[PDB]
Amino acid sequence: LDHGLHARFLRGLSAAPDGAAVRIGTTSVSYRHLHRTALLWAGALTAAGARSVGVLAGKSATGYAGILAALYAGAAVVPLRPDFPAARTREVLRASDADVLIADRAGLPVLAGALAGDVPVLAPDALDGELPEGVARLVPRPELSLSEPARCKPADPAYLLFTSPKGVVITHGATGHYFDVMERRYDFGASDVFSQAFDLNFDCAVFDLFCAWGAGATVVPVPPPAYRDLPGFITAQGITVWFSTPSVIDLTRRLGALDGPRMPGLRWSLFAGEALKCRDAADWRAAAPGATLENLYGPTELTITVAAHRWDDEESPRAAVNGLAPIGAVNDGHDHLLLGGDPSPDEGELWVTGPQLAAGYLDPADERGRFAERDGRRWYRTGDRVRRAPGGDLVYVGRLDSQLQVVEPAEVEHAVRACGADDAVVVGVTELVAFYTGIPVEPRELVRRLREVVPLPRHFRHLDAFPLNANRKTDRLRLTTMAADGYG
Numbered sequence: 001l002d003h004g005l006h007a008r009f010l011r012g013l014s015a016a017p018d019g020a021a022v023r024i025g026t027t028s029v030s031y032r033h034l035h036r037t038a039l040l041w042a043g044a045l046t047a048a049g050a051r052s053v054g055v056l057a058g059k060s061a062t063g064y065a066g067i068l069a070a071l072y073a074g075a076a077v078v079p080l081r082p083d084f085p086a087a088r089t090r091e092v093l094r095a096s097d098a099d100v101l102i103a104d105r106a107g108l109p110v111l112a113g114a115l116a117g118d119v120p121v122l123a124p125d126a127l128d129g130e131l132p133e134g135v136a137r138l139v140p141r142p143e144l145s146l147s148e149p150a151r152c153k154p155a156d157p158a159y160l161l162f163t164s165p166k167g168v169v170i171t172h173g174a175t176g177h178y179f180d181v182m183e184r185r186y187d188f189g190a191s192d193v194f195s196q197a198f199d200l201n202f203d204c205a206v207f208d209l210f211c212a213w214g215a216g217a218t219v220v221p222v223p224p225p226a227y228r229d230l231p232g233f234i235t236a237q238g239i240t241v242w243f244s245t246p247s248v249i250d251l252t253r254r255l256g257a258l259d260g261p262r263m264p265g266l267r268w269s270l271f272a273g274e275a276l277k278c279r280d281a282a283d284w285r286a287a288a289p290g291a292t293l294e295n296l297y298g299p300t301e302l303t304i305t306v307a308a309h310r311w312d313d314e315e316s317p318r319a320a321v322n323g324l325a326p327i328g329a330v331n332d333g334h335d336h337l338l339l340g341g342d343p344s345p346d347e348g349e350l351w352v353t354g355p356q357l358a359a360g361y362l363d364p365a366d367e368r369g370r371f372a373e374r375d376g377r378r379w380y381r382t383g384d385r386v387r388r389a390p391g392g393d394l395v396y397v398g399r400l401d402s403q404l405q406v407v408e409p410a411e412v413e414h415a416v417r418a419c420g421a422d423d424a425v426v427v428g429v430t431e432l433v434a435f436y437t438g439i440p441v442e443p444r445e446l447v448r449r450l451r452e453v454v455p456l457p458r459h460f461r462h463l464d465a466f467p468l469n470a471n472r473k474t475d476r477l478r479l480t481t482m483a484a485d486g487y488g
């Protein structure tokens, strides 16, 4: 089992071959059935010489098997979003130099557009007349099926993932170090049931898949209606491990769904992608009291997550800064610094180096200003302002470049929440606009409260919800435009 990332799936296969690898609605696909499908598809990918495989698919059997088939063929997985604009998907195919495309039924309608810039398509569910004319089809033959998955070197690409817009090359070796280190934090086993909440083109979906599969556990895609009541969905499905952006907490709370211990069977409550508020952690924890909660942090260029904090109902609120839970300690095997060009013991840009470094970007020229040399080593400059609490825990404060002159928006946001908002986004237009959710407050009352907690924005906007970007993060760029249009 030295194959690479996909060796995690082989370990599940060995532990629960006939157990459910993926549960899609009212049906399951077994490890064994995914394995054989991937061997079959990989034989076709191998015969066509595939080094990079576009996976143009949703949360379908085809899409999960397509990921595995790509890895089984020794190729990088290049996830493509069927619901993304076709022209964007064209750019990604060009940039990644994808050799083959695997498409499910959600991918078919976008495929004519996707291929309108030599790239055969493996689309099991399609009829011939459903592929655009010109496009050659990969029809996997059982006689060319591999007898076993390709074995890859730690340097080989496993995944090509795009940030929000550069292509990041994630290696087998880096995911190998990642899962080795994350597995040791947890107690996953074959009876666990993992959410699959992240989109397939977002790096955290790799944790969903390979932590579950590494344990012989079951992956359960979270369909969009489920967000009307996440705790109901978790309990109905017997989900033991939950992982998402922490926006789902305020969402669930707002809908009245976060009242009482509605998730008794949950064991792990994991959040990544944006700042986690203390208050949000404690609220989720009351709703899922038998689940350990963790705040997981990191950028795509450091393989999935690169720091972790295990929430403690008593200690974490003490270490909190600006109402935000700590991001904790960097993953084992990594060093970090907080730079001001001089290191600080207290606060600065977080720089990290270690085995989880991406191999780099699809265009090396993009590395400059992002990857950096220091003390003979290669680091990733996160562009995040991070503080060290007493205790040693790191705490994320904000984007390094968010500072203004009129000011640290994150301190204003914290003051708005201490005055009663569920959440706040403070942006510049130079003056301040403070968007907030929660109970509406007349702005002169909000100012009175803010002068009481911090002895100020000139404009306050109440929203039912912040807008979210493609990754289900607060869309701060959208809000900055809303501010400029309204008050420029």
Ligand SMILES: C[C@H](N)C(=O)NS(=O)(=O)OC[C@H]1O[C@@H](n2cnc3c(N)ncnc32)[C@H](O)[C@@H]1O
Residues within 6 Å of the ligand: 163, 164, 203, 204, 271, 272, 273, 274, 275, 276, 295, 296, 297, 298, 299, 300, 301, 303, 304, 305, 327, 382, 384, 396
């Ligand atoms: C978790 C996933 N690797 C991710 O979100 N990658 S990303 O490249 O899309 O975005 C990374 C940025 O999200 C923010 N972020 C990610 N996880 C976070 C956490 N737990 N707390 C605060 N900020 C976080 C930071 O600004 C970070 O640099």
